[PDB]
């Protein structure tokens, strides 16, 4: 029988021991520019969120880049998404509350063959 | 201004903006590997692994003049800390391969 730290009723205790909360591999990498389905990043700052740096990707093109560097629109650039947890800080007044949230991040794009439909 | 090292949260996880066959249709295809951890929330995480070193060309064959590379993302997970305790957690940062993209070996001019 092992001891547990005290947790107030109807709560969850969260230890945030992460050093460099906003450190991202996307900063030094340039695969977003080298990709056949290239993408852009939009970076926003939210001081009431952990992590505070909000990074979203957007596909640059409809189609995919070929050998010549030209768009082949018979192929699709599609965004790929990842679910993550965030901590949101809420203020009523000077009173502060914290909550866990699940968010979706568009991390980049890939090049896929299209799904084809027919009329009849 | 900064978030404290330790916070109390309520029992509700608020879903924001949440809710396919790309792993096969992509010119940089990948395989998904299951990572299960009962001490972790989410307990199951799917990890992408690029199927080839090269990319698929117009003919459907592997072109090694292009590369399949992972798109990796830093995500936050919950780890029960101490492991046997139900309501105390460590917010843990992990690097996950979400999928793969096709890249030219250098940025082209
Ligand atoms: C994607 O972003 C471009 C902006 O150019 C980027 O600049 C650098 C940061 C680098 O990453 C480059 O490779 C990128 O191309 C957007 O293009 C601009 O759009 C404005 C209109 O809003 C236009 O006036 C500018 O001339 C454009 N600049 C360039 C260089 O093209 C582009 O619209 C973004 N695409 C999407 C879909 O959001």
CB contact under 8 A, B26 and A82: no
Q: Which of B8, B28, B75 sits opposite A110 (nearest CB)?
A: B28
Architecture per CATH, A1-120? Ribbon (2.10)
β-pair partners for A77 = A111
Q: Among A34, A39, A40, say which to mutate for ligand 1: greatest number of ligand atoms within 8 Å of CB.
A: A40
**Which segments of chain B are extended strands (E)?**
6-10, 14-15, 30-36, 40-41, 44-50, 55-56, 62-63, 67-80, 88-103
Cβ–Cβ contact B34 with A under 8 A? no
β-pair partners for A56 = A42
Cα of first residue to Cα of last residue in chain A, in angstroms, is 68
Tokens representing residue B15 in the block: 């879903």
Find, in chain A, the residue whose alpha carbon is nearest to that of B21.
A112
Start-end of H helices in chain B = 22-25
CB contact under 8 A, B71 and A80: yes
Say what the alpha-carbon torsion angle B78, B79, B81, B82 is, to the nearest 10 degrees.
150
Tokens representing residue B36 in the block: 């299960």
At how many Å resolution was this determined?
A: 2.3
- The sign of the dihedral angle between the CA atoms of A18, A23, A24, A28 is negative
The rounded distance, in Å, linking the Cα atoms of A86 and B11 is: 14
- Using left for φ > 0, alpha for ψ between -120 and 50, and beta otherwise, residue B60 falls in left
CB contact under 8 A, A11 and B9: yes
Q: How far is the CA of B107 from the centre of ligand 1 (A)?
A: 16
Which chain B residues are Cβ-neighbours of A37 within 8 angstroms?
Answer: 101-102
Tokens representing residue B3 in the block: 């978030």
Q: How far is the CA of A39 from the centre of ligand 1 (A)?
A: 10
- The sign of the dihedral angle between the CA atoms of B73, B76, B81, B84 is negative
**Does A42 sit in the ligand 1 pocket, CB within 6 Å?**
no
β-pair partners for A35 = B103
Q: How far is the CA of B95 from the centre of ligand 1 (A)?
A: 28
DSSP of A32-91: HHHBSS-EEEEEEE-TTEES-EEEEEEES-SSEE-SSS-EETTSEEEEEEEEEEEEEEEE
Give the three-class secondary structure for A17.
coil
CB contact under 8 A, B104 and A34: yes
CB count within 10 Å of CB A116 equals: 5
Element (H, E) at A110: strand A96-112
Of the candidates B81, B6, B12, which has an alpha carbon nearest to the alpha carbon of residue A101? B12
Tokens representing residue B103 in the block: 């890249």
Q: Which domains does chain B have, with CATH numbers?
A: 1-109 (2.10.90.10)
The rounded distance, in Å, linking the Cα atoms of B38 and B69 is: 30
Backbone angles phi, psi at A6, to 5 degrees: -70, 140
| Beta carbons of A84 and A103 less than 8 angstroms apart | yes
| Residue tagged 């090694």 (tokens) | B64
| Beta carbons of B91 and A15 less than 8 angstroms apart | yes
The rounded distance, in Å, linking the Cα atoms of A83 and A107 is: 10
- The residues spanned by each domain of chain A are 1-120
The rounded distance, in Å, linking the Cα atoms of B27 and A73 is: 14
Find, in chain A, the residue whose alpha carbon is nearest to that of B7.
A14
The rounded distance, in Å, linking the Cα atoms of B7 and A92 is: 16
Q: Is the peptide bond before B65 cis (omega within 30 degrees of 0)?
A: no
Experiment used for this model: X-ray
- The sign of the dihedral angle between the CA atoms of A110, B25, B96, B55 is negative
């Amino acid at each position: 029988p092992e001891s547990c730290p005290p947790v107030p009723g109807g709560s969850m205790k969260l230890d945030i021991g992460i050093i460099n909360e906003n450190q991202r591999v996307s900063m030094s990498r340039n695969i977003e520019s080298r990709s056949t389905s290239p993408w852009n990043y939009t970076v926003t700052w939210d001081p009431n969120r952990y992590p505070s740096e909000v990074v979203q990707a957007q596909c640059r093109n409809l189609g995919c880049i070929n050998a010549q560097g030209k768009e082949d629109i018979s192929m699709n650039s599609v965004p790929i998404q990842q679910e993550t947890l965030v901590v949101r800080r809420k203020h009523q007044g000077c009173s502060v509350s914290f909550q866990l949230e699940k968010v979706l991040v568009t991390v980049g794009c890939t090049c896929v063959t299209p799904v084809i439909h027919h009329v009849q | 201004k900064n978030f404290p090292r330790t916070v109390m949260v309520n029992l509700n996880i608020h879903n924001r903006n949440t809710n396919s066959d790309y792993y096969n249709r992509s010119t940089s295809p990948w395989n998904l590997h299951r990572n299960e951890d009962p001490e972790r929330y989410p307990s199951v995480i799917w990890e992408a692994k690029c199927r080839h070193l090269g990319c698929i060309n117009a003919d459907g064959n592997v072109d090694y003049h292009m590369n399949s590379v992972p798109i990796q993302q830093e995500i936050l997970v919950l780890r029960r800390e101490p492991p046997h305790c139900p309501n105390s957690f460590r917010l843990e940062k992990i690097l996950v391969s979400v999928g793969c993209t096709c890249v030219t070996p250098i940025v082209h001019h």
